[PDB]
């Protein structure tokens, strides 16, 4: 949290390539591990607005008194029927809650579809996610996207990435 945090940290979306003499291995064979940093801003969870009387189509019909209520949202085209109760008002209230539930469901599906499309694009770019390479065996740090290098691995892993993030942010990647 803080001002401009997502803007400062938005270039970190991607993969880091560790090459180091692994201590967990018994033989001291070096290991090439990977990690991902994924940053996303805290979007505002907007309130779900109610539906309009003109946007709804309200019909009443005989249950199988015409207490059965068929509410149809016209601009999207979705219907819900309710016929179990003798009260037409109860039928209409249950149909209206069904309307709200399906609208929330469809909004979530639309959001997930847009997220899936963005994921299709960033899975298409794919290998470009490998953004950073730390060779602790040879002691060199490399940003492949900007291509920049340094040797102070202890400073980099201490957190002196200001030069790298400024290079990436001026690159626009």
């Amino acid at each position: 949290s803080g001002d401009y945090a997502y803007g400062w940290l938005r270039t970190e979306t991607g993969v880091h390539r560790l090459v180091r003499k692994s201590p967990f291995d018994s033989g001291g064979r070096r290991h090439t591990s990977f990690s991902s940093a994924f940053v996303y801003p805290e979007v505002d969870d907007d309130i779900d607005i109610e539906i309009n009387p003109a946007d709804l189509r309200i019909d009443v019909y005989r249950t199988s008194t015409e207490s059965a209520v068929r509410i149809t949202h016209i601009p999207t085209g979705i219907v819900t029927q309710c016929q179990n109760d003798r009260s037409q008002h109860k039928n209409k209230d249950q149909a209206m809650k069904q309307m709200k539930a399906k609208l929330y469901e469809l909004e979530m599906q639309k959001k997930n579809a847009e997220k899936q499309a963005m994921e299709d694009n960033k899975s298409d770019i794919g290998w470009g996610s490998q953004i950073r390479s730390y060779v602790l065996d040879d002691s060199r740090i490399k940003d492949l996207r900007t291509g920049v290098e340094t040797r102070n691995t202890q400073a980099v892993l201490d957190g002196s990435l200001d030069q790298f993030i400024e290079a990436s942010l001026k690159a626009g990647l």
């Binding site: 991607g14 990690s35 991902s36 960033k122 794919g126 996610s129």
Partner: peptide, 10 residues
């Protein structure tokens, strides 16, 4: 991929 493709490629 419908949640996170970076972790998916991991």
């Amino acid at each position: 991929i419908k949640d996170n493709a970076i972790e998916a490629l991991l």
